[PDB]
Design a binder for these strands. Structure first.
Ligand SMILES: [Mg+2]
Ligand SMILES: [Mg+2]
Ligand SMILES: [Mg+2]
Ligand SMILES: [Mg+2]
Ligand SMILES: [Mg+2]
Ligand SMILES: [Mg+2]
Ligand SMILES: [Mg+2]
Ligand SMILES: [Mg+2]
Ligand SMILES: [Mg+2]
Ligand SMILES: [Mg+2]
Ligand SMILES: [Mg+2]
Ligand SMILES: [Mg+2]
Ligand SMILES: [Mg+2]
Lengths: 39, 179, 148, 259
RNA sequence: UAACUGAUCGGAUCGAGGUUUACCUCGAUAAAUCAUCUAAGUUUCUGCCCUAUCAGCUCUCGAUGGUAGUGUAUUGGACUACCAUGGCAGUCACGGGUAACGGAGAAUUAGGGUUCGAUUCCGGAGAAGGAGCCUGAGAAACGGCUACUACAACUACGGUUCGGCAG
RNA sequence: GCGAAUGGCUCAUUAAAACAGUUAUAGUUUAUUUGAUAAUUAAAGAUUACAUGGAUAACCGAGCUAAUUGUUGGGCUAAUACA
């Protein structure tokens, strides 16, 4: 259980991180989608 | 460790003037008209009539479209109806006031048992509703000062009482020795 | 005879039983004896009598109607574990209720003033009725009883 | 005072428990838990007076002490005479697989809503605070005193989450902003459910909020009392007493006895 | 990032139910930090009965403010040191009385008022008077302790009491 | 090991004091509860972790005082105590 602690944490950590790159990728992805039609 | 929490309340009302010639005369003419026992009773009734008018005045103090009046006013009347003090065609609050104590006295288990030819007198009746000789609703009423409601004024007999059930109180004690 | 109407009933699977309000109609005879009420009920439910316990009753001011509450247990073996120690002596299953107070208060007296040595001994003299005892007696009603 | 209080008086125990005035003298005092004293319903109350499964006091003592486990709160077992079941909780009665919502009336009395094995899964959580803690990590906290690890970042402090108890998973949240549905956890207006109109912050130390609903009534209460029962008109849970809307004493009469 | 202390923590503990192995499953409890609940300190503002046959009050040690420190759970003249001289008052200070613990409320009431609130809720204070303290997360506790004042109980007069009914 | 600091009684003190209605804690402590969190055991030392070390109630036996849930004194073994 001591061991399973840092395991579950790495899983959630990399999990979050993996999500962030996908969200942020989209956050900036909509940035040219919104500023494009204004052009 | 005594900490009661039930509630008090006095049904009485002492009069200011203790010897009003004219007032006492009505109280007696009243006690004799309704087979009452003590002046108390008479005040008990006046005190009740009070709560109604004090609540009628309290409500008349309002706009005719007051959420309060509209609701409490009606409900007060609805109650005057269940006890039959005002007739269908006497809605308006203003009528709550013109209520004779003589009228409210007439709607008692006493005043009723007698006016239902169910007794030989305003008094005869009094000992009757006492000896259980009278049942109302699905229950039996012993207390002569019952507030007879319209709806149940039908259900008023003697269920399982010597004058319908199976008597033998003064009879039994009687016939056994005759031999 | 009597006429019973069952009134308000709940279903408690937790304590494994059904709780119900009872309204006995005895227009003529006096208040019904819990005992007799016990069986006219068990019949309407069609359940062993001893698995049905009735408590608390009233009697409207002279009118032949009495209100009360009763209990239906499925396993007398459940009923025996749940019902209160006082309801059992009532069916004459558990027994007595001897006066503990006084003596227990007096032993406190001595014990509070001794060292373990004697204390143990004293304790071997405090008015009986252990819970361990209550159980063995409960248990005996268990095996020795079977039926319906 | 001597130290810390430890009892509770019949008379003093909240009107939300619809308690027996004549009753006794005391009342099971809520145990320090997930919900505050006033905003809670100790189990003993929940079964005895509420459900009515229990009855006498010892009745409970059995139920929660019996080696069978008959009571569940948010997918967990509980054996405390006075666990403070709070708002938006889910209680299951093992031996019957009963599932309930701990929700206030429209008149402010604790009501038990029966759920289908379906809603019994999700529970609505309101966001307490939100800040980052140990080793660069984000934490969110719910009224239900839930502490969350790595939560979606698009969540502002005054949010409302939908919780999948089965997987201890989050899904579809929704902040409080002009145009949502809400439940008011406490106040002269609790038990109501309407559409958020606008939130005027006054910072001086107390922001307020307005609301509309069915008969389009105007409601006013402090933010701390707003719980987002949902995003954009659609509520997220079945409400007790029909829809979260109370009637004039006048409307109650006309609806019941039709006056 | 730098270093300090190491008297902070990082489990030498306990069940039960399973099951041909390598074990498996659900729990007890200890304990650190953050939340949380609970409660407590201290705090802002507003409001009290008679009375000037009470008008000036507080300031040798704190009275009002500033500085630095102590000390505390923390704020603070709360205490020390140094410095400034302020702080309050007829819009009643300061002082005195109260058979005055404050509320929620209680009695009579056209309206406005008059008089009470020891006393079930809440908050406060106290346990013979007064001060001191152990312990603890928590009390100056008081159905705990220490000394003094006045007392209560036993004595073989050496000494002793788990001696305080405003439960 | 917790509890004994809840309750229960009383109002003697006490007129901005206490109280109430309000507010603050960015000026604080909170055992018990509920949620979560911990990969690295500090240096010197020392070192078994399939897991360490020493002592004491209860008990056995001797004893004191006129006296109390007084306590001396010798011998015996366990902990989530202690180390
Ligand atoms: Mg008869
Ligand atoms: Mg006993
Ligand atoms: Mg408890
Ligand atoms: Mg703020
Ligand atoms: Mg085994
Ligand atoms: Mg300073
Ligand atoms: Mg004075
Ligand atoms: Mg006074
Ligand atoms: Mg008190
Ligand atoms: Mg206070
Ligand atoms: Mg006495
Ligand atoms: Mg003040
Ligand atoms: Mg020895």
């Amino acid at each position: 259980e001591k061991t399973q602690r840092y395991v579950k944490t790495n899983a959630a950590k990399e999990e979050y991180e993996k999500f962030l790159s996908e969200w942020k990728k989209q956050r900036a992805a909509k940035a040219h989608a919104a500023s494009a039609p204004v052009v | 460790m005594g900490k009661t929490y039930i509630n008090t309340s006095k049904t009485y009302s002492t009069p200011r003037r203790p010897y009003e010639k004219e007032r006492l005369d009505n109280e007696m003419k009243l006690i004799g008209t309704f087979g009452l026992k003590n002046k108390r009773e008479v005040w008990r009734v006046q005190m009740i009539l009070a709560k109604f008018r004090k609540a009628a005045r309290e409500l008349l103090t309002l706009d005719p479209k007051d959420p309060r009046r509209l609701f409490e006013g009606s409900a007060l009347l609805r109650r005057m109806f269940k006890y039959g003090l005002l007739s269908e065609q006497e809605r308006k609050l203003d009528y709550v006031l013109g209520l004779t104590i003589h009228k409210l006295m007439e709607r008692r288990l006493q005043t009723r048992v007698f006016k239902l030819n169910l007794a030989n007198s305003i008094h005869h009746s009094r000992v009757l509703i006492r000896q259980r000789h009278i049942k109302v609703g699905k229950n039996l009423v012993n207390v002569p000062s019952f507030m007879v409601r319209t709806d149940s004024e039908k259900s008023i007999d003697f269920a399982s009482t010597s004058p319908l059930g199976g008597g033998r109180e003064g009879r039994t004690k009687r016939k056994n020795a005759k031999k | 005879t009597i006429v019973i109407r069952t009134k308000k009933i709940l279903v408690n699977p937790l304590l494994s039983r059904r709780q119900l309000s009872l309204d006995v109609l005895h227009p003529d005879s006096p208040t019904a004896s819990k005992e007799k009420i016990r069986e006219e009920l068990a019949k309407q439910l069609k359940v062993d009598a001893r698995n049905v316990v009735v408590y608390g009753f009233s009697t409207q001011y002279g009118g032949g109607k009495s209100t009360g509450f009763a209990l239906v247990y499925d396993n007398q073996q459940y009923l025996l574990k749940y019902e209160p120690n006082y309801r059992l002596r009532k069916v004459k299953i558990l027994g007595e209720k001897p006066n503990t107070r006084r003596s227990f208060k007096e032993l406190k007296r001595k014990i509070k003033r001794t060292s373990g040595k004697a204390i143990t001994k004293l304790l071997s003299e405090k008015k009986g009725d252990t819970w361990a005892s209550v159980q063995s007696k409960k248990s005996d009603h268990l095996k020795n009883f079977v039926a319906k | 005072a001597r130290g810390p209080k430890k009892h509770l008086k019949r008379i003093n125990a909240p009107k939300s428990w619809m308690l027996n005035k004549l009753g006794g003298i005391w009342a099971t005092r809520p145990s320090q838990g997930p919900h505050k004293l006033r905003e809670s319903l100790p189990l003993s109350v929940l079964l005895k007076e509420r459900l009515n499964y229990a009855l006498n006091g010892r009745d409970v003592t059995l139920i929660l002490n019996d080696k069978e486990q008959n009571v569940f709160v948010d997918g967990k077992v509980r054996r405390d005479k006075g666990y403070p079941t709070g708002l938006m909780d889910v209680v299951r009665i093992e031996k019957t697989d009963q599932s309930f919502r701990i929700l206030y009336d429209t008149k402010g009395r604790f009501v038990l809503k029966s759920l289908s094995k379906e809603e019994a899964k999700y529970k609505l959580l309101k966001v307490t605070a939100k800040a980052i803690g140990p080793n660069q990590i984000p934490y969110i906290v719910t009224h239900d005193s839930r502490t969350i690890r790595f939560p979606n970042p698009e969540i502002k402090i005054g949010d409302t989450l939908k919780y999948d108890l089965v997987n201890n998973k989050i899904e579809n949240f929704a902040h409080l902003e002009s145009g949502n549905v809400c439940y008011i956890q406490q106040g002269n207006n609790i038990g109501r459910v309407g559409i958020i109109q606008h939130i005027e912050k006054h910072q001086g130390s107390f922001d307020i909020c307005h609301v509309k609903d069915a008969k389009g009534n105007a409601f006013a209460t402090r933010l701390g009392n707003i719980f987002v029962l949902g995003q954009g008109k659609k509520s997220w849970i079945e409400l007790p007493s029909g829809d979260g809307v109370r009637e004039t004493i006048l409307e109650e009469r006309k609806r019941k006895f039709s006056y």
